[PDB]
Design a protein around this ligand. Structure first.
Ligand SMILES: CCCCCCCCCCCCCCCCCC(=O)O[C@@H](COC(=O)CCCCCCCCCCCCCCC)COP(=O)(O)OCC[N+](C)(C)C
Ligand SMILES: CCCCCCCCCCCCCCCCCCCC(=O)O[C@H](COC(=O)CCCCCCCCCCCCCC)COP(=O)(O)OCCN
Lengths: 48, 70, 66, 93, 487, 615, 75, 76
């Protein structure tokens, strides 16, 4: 009925989910570090 | 006189151009050498010594050894 | 009439150094009066003992240990 | 879609982090950093609450604030020593 | 769902649409450019609303592969530090478009297209979380700004200023690129979140920090390299100066906040007295050199060096008052300084001159301009109730806690800042008129009155209730204060 | 009801400045006068309620700055000290507003003048009703901005702009000192609020490292705050702005510089008394500076011929008196003398402006005389003001200056003796130049021109009601408020002012000294009056000594030209800094030295290098 | 002085230095006014209705209610 | 002069005197009165009086925070 109620129920819907954000960040760090290790070992390969 | 543009004066315009074209006006005299070697080489050193000594005296007051600021 | 290079910043009976000397004398008057006040030593000529308050100089009421 | 209400944070030291070699598990490092920031903010807010208590002790008491707010003032000044990112007095958290 | 992809794609669509429009349709070009800028600004404002202020993790993260093995990739994300920079760089563009509204018939479509490409490049700079791609968009701004300075310059000096600016930016850029390459080879990747969890050997911190400082100090002119800024700034259109001072001067400080203050916590502490020394003399020297300038745009351009060097004192204090209060100064400076160049642009468009000697007595012929000019004079001189004072005072209390001497030297900045700021206003506005030089006047039109309105509202709103901006940053700036610290 | 006290002047200014084109020169005056008068009556109820009812009110609107612990909210603190400043500032502001209705009757831009007056009153109210050190700073710098705006209200003049910019520079040095003091306050107590700082002002006994020096934390903060107080109150260090600031309108002189904004430093010292009491080193500095300022202004003001400038040095002397009265750690007497002076100095400025306006803006006393019969009312009013100023017995200026002098006598210390001596000689000098101003303007044979006398008109109603109210004040208010403020054991101040039990000498000031000491000011005033009469009304005029003695001429120049401050300080600081701006920083550091080693000074050898590749 | 009607029928000088339009007509808006005004209206609506309706998520609020809880548990 | 009558200023200009300043003055008071009502209502709500007055003061008619902070030990 009032603008404030709809506005807050809309903002709460627009805002992102916290747990999945942190989970994505942690998995990103894991995968990036693993890929970093593999890429460094790849660079370690000699030309011959 | 139906124009908003200024009626620029030769004296003012030339004075401003001279004041803005000062890049090519050094003669490398002793006054410039002394001036740039004092107020551009010594004052920064004095200030840097001031902050370094302030940090050192803050460190000694708390009893912690001096921090290697280098 | 070309303008001067420093044409952005522009007591005639006195000079800067002479007026500085006059100012130094005027302030030395204050300094000498302060030295005379020190020489008077009014602290030793106080006519009353220092005021003494009860309850140990109001220690508790002034934030002292209870 | 976040749930309505205040944010919820787990109040526990992230397991796996060891101060001997902090740069060992990167995820435990950022979690530990966030956690430490959270308790430093908790300490800051506790000091602020004590400051409010002292503030309203000075006004309600009046002239007698020297003996009535002594207990609060020393608590507030004891709690402002280890505030956080302030003077060289840094807490050993 | 509003993400960083749409905010960046909006200027792309705006620039592409005008790219294939006949130049004879001058009205349509202006309307479409202005509409694109306004839509981008509203998109940024919406992105502010859904910004979480309780997590230090980067928000609205987006990824796009760049190398085949995902070593380096387009990682876009914002935090409490770079959100307001994005909002400001999207807000300044419509003002720049509106500045050249009347004379747009001569510039053509290449003007709005250049400014929209500029907005595209600056939005991605504040959103990149990859060290290498941050450099790619860091130095992609040269081409649009080179074109803006050269094609639409005032006099024949535009060739020299563009060359000088380009050369300085290149010499900084490649010396930074070598450090970026060395970091990539050693660590393995260039992701910021990975580079913030990698221990750097103490010997490599000094070299990499110096190499990063070489490129950043040019764009935040410390002492030896603030000679390109005055010339390139004066030889620029009215809207061109707003971009150079509003945003282009915020790359150096943002680069320090994002890639220097955290990736090397040990190196930052060692070089703290060095930054304090450079910033202290820069505040003293520049605020003093400003008194003996005669060009209207060369005085305000020297009011930015003192303000921007006061920011680098705040960042290196490494506390909530310092780092947090330095951000408000740049938002305040991005509004106060860019508004002053609008005031000078108002005077220059009518009377094609910039010398302060020709100006005087405008209080009797342009009263609305005098009222607006005076207000931004007060903001430039750090008056309470203005956004500048909040940032200026928070930096001082953040540096006094670390070093009382540097806070004392920086405090004389407001002594000298209040000197030339009012003394310029007295010359230009107050005084008697000079009908011999100039005699026809016109006060602010509808555009100028409306353009200054968001600056007026956004300057006191931040100046009386800065809690709206501050509370969105404390979670993000507190994690920045301590990185290597664990106690 | 208390927010209305602060915001009515703001609303009046915001109406009279934004919509003055619809109200004209009369509606803009009515808006500001009505708003300030309603604020004044509200301050009267505030005095009946807080000061007399002994129930202070604390009002916080919203947080302004919220860092980790740098909290400086939008708080208003109304205690006994604040309410006195309210009933002084707002009442004087309303009377000045009423005065300016008739004073600015022919000036074209009257509405902007009233808008500036209202905004100044609003800033002063924010200053006095400040709960934090930042809201206090907000008012402390807004008051300087308003004074600068009002000093060059006639922007066409060049002297007005120079005076305004000099005032801003001096107030800016003062603001730098105050900002350093505030930064020191937050570093110790981690707060800027007055309640917390004054509650915890006794515990800290540590030492800091300030500018390569190890000093006391509290003493350094108190000295830094006193620097700001010196900057605003025109003390020994920084006072040259006040005499030059008379180029503004007379109502600007009467309010901006007589009653308010010069007492800002005294008010800040009195309010921060629970902090200044724990730094005995700062009190010595305050006492010395106050004594020096009083004596120097008294010596400078005896040879001026401008009507407005003589009164400015009287204000400087009175402010010096208040300052070293604060230095004896007796803040009640300082505020009492502040409130007393804000009456008989505003009256003096208003009567002088009434004389000047009727005399075709003639400001030189050498060109007026025999105005007593022509200007009966204004002559009587200036007589009342001068008698109060010199400290005539049983008058407003007698209940405060005499108490200050006898208190300075009983402060048996090195600093107290110096202040007592200077304040004793300053009484004689003040009597001399006050009576010279009274004699030359009104009682000597006429020296004016025929045209000035022909066009004469005494003060009309709008310029006479504030005068009469100020006369009643300068007659009775000192006696009425003598008991509540400087009485023995009075609880009127409650917790507003703190005086430690150790440094309390109010009781001995009354019965511990010979009766001669209590009569020294009266004897010196009589001597000064006799000297002034014998040198002005009847004398052989031995001025031939000034034409034959080289020392006498230079001595006359020394007192006339403000002890050679403006000339010496200009040449040795302002001119030196102007040269430091161009001849070095712009001429050598960044002109070509960076260029020659930069990209084109010598780096253009690539033209002399690329062309050689043909080899 | 305080009773005589004024002489200036309308304020001197036109507002924004624009001549009033033809009688019985209206000020024709420029090509930028409508988009700028709808933008300025939407900005106010979004900021007033969005900032005041977003949840009070902050580190000075969660920490406040956590400190206010641990401050009493110590007793 | 002749040209200062063609300059628009918010304050009104030199010697400004509109024909209907009486009516405009009355409106301005009413506008100031209307905006002063919420300020007075706001002030009476956020104001705190820790001490009961010696005698009945007029602020007790509207203000209700009299002797409320006496338990300062539980302040936030
Ligand atoms: C920002 C925080 C501090 C705020 C302080 C505000 C102090 C006033 C600042 C502006 C004052 C105006 C100074 C610049 C303009 C110089 C005079 C001028 O030209 O202004 C016009 C416009 O009138 C004004 O001055 C309006 C500006 C002041 C009125 C608005 C102020 C509203 C209250 C102050 C702000 C409220 C909040 C303050 C606290 C944060 C007046 O012209 P006239 O008097 O008619 O004479 C000129 C001759 N001729 C007509 C021929 C052109
Ligand atoms: C015709 C003009 C003539 C000249 C006028 C001169 C200036 C006069 C106007 C002064 C400016 C007024 C702005 C308001 C300042 C005081 C109020 C502060 C705002 C405020 O307290 O509310 C916060 C935001 O809401 C809001 O109310 C936000 C709405 C504000 C809209 C402002 C739009 C400015 C546009 C600037 C664009 C650029 C922005 C900068 C990048 C929420 O408070 P909270 O956080 O505590 O939430 C608590 C929830 N439980």
């Amino acid at each position: 009925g009032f603008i404030m109620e709809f506005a807050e129920n809309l903002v709460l819907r627009l805002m992102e989910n916290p747990e999945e954000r942190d989970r994505k960040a942690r998995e990103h760090i894991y995968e990036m570090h693993e890929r970093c290790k593999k890429i460094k070992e790849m660079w370690a390969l000699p030309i011959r | 006189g139906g124009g908003m543009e200024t009626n620029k004066n030769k004296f003012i315009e030339d004075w401003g151009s001279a004041r803005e074209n000062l890049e090519h006006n050094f003669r490398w005299t002793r006054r410039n050498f002394a001036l740039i070697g004092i107020f551009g080489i010594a004052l920064p050193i004095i200030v840097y010594k001031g902050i370094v000594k302030d940090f050192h005296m803050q460190d000694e007051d708390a009893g912690r050894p001096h921090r290697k600021f280098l | 009439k070309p303008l001067s290079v420093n044409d952005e910043l522009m007591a005639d009976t006195v000079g800067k150094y002479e007026a500085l000397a006059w100012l130094s004398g005027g302030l030395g008057f204050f300094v000498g009066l302060g030295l005379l006040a020190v020489l008077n030593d009014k602290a030793s000529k106080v006519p009353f003992t220092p005021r003494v308050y009860p309850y140990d100089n109001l220690r508790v009421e002034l934030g002292g240990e209870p | 879609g976040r749930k309505k209400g205040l944010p919820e944070f787990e109040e526990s030291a992230p397991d796996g982090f060891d101060p001997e070699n902090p740069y060992k598990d990167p995820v435990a490092m950022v979690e530990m950093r966030e956690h430490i920031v959270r308790e430093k903010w908790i300490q800051i807010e506790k000091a602020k609450i004590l400051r409010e208590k002292v503030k309203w002790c000075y006004r309600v008491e009046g002239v007698n604030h020297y003996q009535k707010c002594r207990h609060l003032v020393q608590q507030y000044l004891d709690s402002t020593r280890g505030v956080g990112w302030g003077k060289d007095h840094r807490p050993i958290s | 769902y509003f993400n960083l992809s749409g905010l960046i794609l909006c200027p792309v669509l705006g620039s592409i649409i005008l790219l294939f429009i006949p130049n004879s349709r001058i009205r349509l070009i202006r309307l479409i450019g202005l509409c694109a800028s306004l839509i981008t600004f509203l998109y940024s404002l919406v992105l502010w609303i859904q910004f979480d202020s309780s997590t230090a993790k980067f928000q609205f993260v987006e990824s796009l592969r760049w190398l085949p093995y995902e070593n380096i990739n387009f990682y876009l994300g914002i935090d409490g530090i770079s959100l307001f920079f994005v909002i400001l760089t999207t807000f300044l563009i419509p003002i720049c478009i509106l500045v050249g509204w009347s004379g747009m018939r001569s510039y053509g479509k290449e003007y709005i297209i250049a400014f929209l490409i500029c907005e595209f490049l600056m939005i991605a700079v504040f959103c990149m979380l990859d060290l290498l791609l941050f450099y790619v968009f860091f130095e992609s701004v040269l081409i649009p700004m080179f074109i803006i300075i050269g094609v639409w310059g005032s006099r024949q000096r535009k060739i020299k200023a563009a060359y000088q600016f380009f050369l300085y930016t290149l010499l900084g850029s490649l010396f930074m690129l070598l450090a970026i390459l060395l970091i990539l080879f050693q660590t393995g990747t260039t992701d910021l979140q990975i580079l913030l969890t990698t221990e750097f050997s103490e010997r490599r911190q000094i070299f990499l920090w110096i190499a990063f400082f070489a490129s950043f100090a040019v764009k935040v002119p410390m002492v030896p390299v603030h000679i390109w800024l005055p010339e390139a700034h004066v030889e620029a259109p009215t809207a061109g100066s707003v971009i150079l001072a509003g945003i282009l001067l915020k790359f150096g400080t943002y680069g320090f906040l994002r890639f220097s203050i955290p990736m090397f916590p040990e190196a930052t502490l060692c070089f703290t007295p060095f930054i304090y020394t450079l910033s202290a003399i820069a505040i003293i020297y520049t605020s003093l050199t400003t008194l003996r300038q005669i060009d209207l745009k060369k005085i305000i351009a020297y009011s930015s060096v003192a303000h921007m060097n006061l920011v680098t004192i705040g960042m290196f204090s490494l506390n909530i008052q310092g780092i947090g209060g330095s951000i408000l100064l740049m938002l305040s400076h991005g509004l106060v300084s860019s508004a002053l160049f609008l005031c000078v642009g108002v005077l220059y468009d009518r009377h094609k001159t910039r010398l302060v000697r020709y100006y005087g007595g405008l209080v009797s012929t342009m009263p609305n301009f005098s009222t607006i000019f005076f207000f931004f004079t007060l903001a430039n001189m750090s008056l309470p109730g203005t956004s500048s004072f909040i940032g200026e005072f928070l930096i001082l209390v953040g540096a006094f806690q670390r070093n009382s001497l540097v806070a004392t030297l920086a405090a004389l900045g407001m002594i000298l800042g209040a000197a030339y700021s009012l003394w310029l206003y007295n010359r230009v506005v107050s005084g008697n008129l000079k009908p011999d030089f100039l005699h026809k006047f016109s006060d602010l039109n509808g555009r100028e009155v409306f353009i200054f309105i968001p600056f007026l509202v956004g300057l006191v709103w931040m100046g009386v209730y800065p809690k709206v901006f501050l509370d969105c940053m404390h979670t993000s700036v507190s994690n920045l204060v301590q990185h290597g610290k664990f106690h | 009801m208390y927010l209305l006290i602060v915001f009515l002047p703001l609303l009046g200014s915001s109406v009279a400045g934004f919509f003055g084109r619809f109200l004209g020169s009369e509606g803009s005056a009515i808006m500001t006068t009505t708003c300030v008068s309603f604020s004044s009556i509200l301050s009267l109820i505030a005095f009946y309620e807080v000061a007399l009812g002994a129930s202070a009110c604390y009002l916080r609107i919203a947080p302004w700055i919220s860092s980790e612990m740098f909290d400086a909210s939008w708080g208003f603190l109304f205690d006994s000290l604040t309410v006195v400043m309210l009933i002084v500032v707002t009442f004087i502001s309303s009377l000045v507003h009423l005065y300016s209705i008739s004073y600015m009757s022919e000036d074209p831009h009257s509405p902007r003048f009233m808008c500036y007056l209202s905004i100044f009153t609003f800033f002063m109210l924010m200053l006095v009703t400040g709960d934090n050190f930042l809201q206090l700073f907000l008012g402390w710098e807004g008051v300087g901005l308003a004074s600068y705006l009002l000093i060059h209200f006639w922007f066409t003049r060049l002297q007005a702009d120079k005076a305004a910019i000099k005032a801003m520079l001096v107030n800016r040095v003062g603001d730098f000192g105050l900002a350093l003091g505030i930064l020191g306050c937050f570093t110790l107590f981690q707060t800027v609020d007055f309640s917390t700082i004054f509650a915890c002002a006794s515990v800290p006994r540590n030492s800091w490292i300030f500018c390569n020096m190890r000093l006391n934390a509290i003493s350094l903060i108190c000295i830094l705050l006193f620097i700001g107080a010196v900057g605003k109150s025109a003390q020994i260090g920084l006072h040259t702005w006040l005499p030059d600031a008379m180029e503004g309108p007379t109502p600007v002189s009467a309010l901006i510089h007589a009653a308010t904004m010069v007492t800002a430093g005294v008010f800040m010292i009195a309010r921060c008394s629970p902090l200044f009491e724990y730094s005995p080193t700062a009190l010595i500095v305050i006492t010395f500076a106050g004594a020096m300022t009083s004596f120097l202004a008294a010596t400078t003001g005896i040879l001026q011929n401008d009507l407005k400038r003589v009164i400015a040095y009287s204000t400087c002397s009175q402010l010096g008196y208040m300052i070293f009265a604060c230095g004896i750690s007796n803040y009640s007497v300082s505020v009492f003398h502040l409130m007393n002076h804000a009456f008989f100095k505003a009256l003096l400025f208003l009567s002088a402006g009434s004389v000047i306006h009727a005399m075709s803006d003639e400001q030189d006393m050498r060109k007026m005389g025999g105005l007593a019969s022509s200007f009966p009312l204004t002559y009587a009013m200036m007589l009342i003001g001068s008698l109060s100023l010199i400290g005539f017995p049983f008058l407003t200026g007698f209940y405060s200056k005499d108490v200050i002098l006898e208190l300075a006598y009983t402060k048996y210390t090195i600093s107290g003796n110096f202040a007592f001596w200077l304040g004793s000689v300053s009484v004689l000098f003040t009597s001399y130049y006050s009576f010279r101003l009274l004699f030359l303007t009104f009682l000597v044979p006429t020296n004016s021109f025929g045209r000035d006398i022909s066009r004469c008109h005494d003060a009309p109603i709008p310029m006479a009601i504030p005068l009469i109210l100020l006369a009643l004040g300068s007659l009775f208010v000192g006696y009425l408020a003598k008991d509540m403020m400087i009485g023995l054991g009075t609880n009127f101040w409650a917790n507003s002012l703190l005086v430690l039990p150790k440094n309390e000498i109010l009781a001995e000031s009354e019965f511990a000294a010979p009766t001669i000491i209590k009569l020294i000011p009266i004897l010196f005033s009589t001597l000064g009056a006799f000297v002034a009469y014998n040198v002005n009304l009847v004398a052989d005029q031995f001025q031939r000594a000034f034409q034959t003695s080289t020392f006498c001429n230079r001595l006359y120049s020394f007192f006339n030209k403000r002890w050679f401050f403006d000339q010496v300080l200009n040449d040795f600081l302002v001119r030196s800094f102007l040269r430091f701006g161009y001849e070095v920083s712009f001429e050598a550091l960044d002109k070509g030295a960076i260029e020659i080693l930069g990209p084109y000074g010598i780096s253009y050898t690539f033209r002399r290098l690329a062309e050689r590749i043909s080899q | 002085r305080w009773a005589t009607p004024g002489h200036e029928e309308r304020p001197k000088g036109y507002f924004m230095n624009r001549t009033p339009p033809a009688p019985g007509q209206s000020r024709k808006w420029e090509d930028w006014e409508l988009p700028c005004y709808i933008t300025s209206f939407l900005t106010i609506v979004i900021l007033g209705v969005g900032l005041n309706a977003k949840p009070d998520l902050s580190i000075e609020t969660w920490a406040h209610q956590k400190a206010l809880e641990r401050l009493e548990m110590e007793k | 002069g002749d040209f200062r009558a063609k300059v628009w200023s918010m304050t009104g200009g030199p010697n400004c005197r509109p024909k209907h300043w009486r009516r405009n003055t009355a409106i301005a008071m009413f506008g100031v009165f209307l905006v002063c009502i919420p300020i007075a209502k706001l002030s009476a709500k956020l104001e705190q009086r820790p001490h009961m007055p010696v005698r009945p003061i007029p602020s007790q008619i509207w203000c209700k925070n009299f002797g409320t902070k006496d338990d300062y030990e539980k302040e936030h």
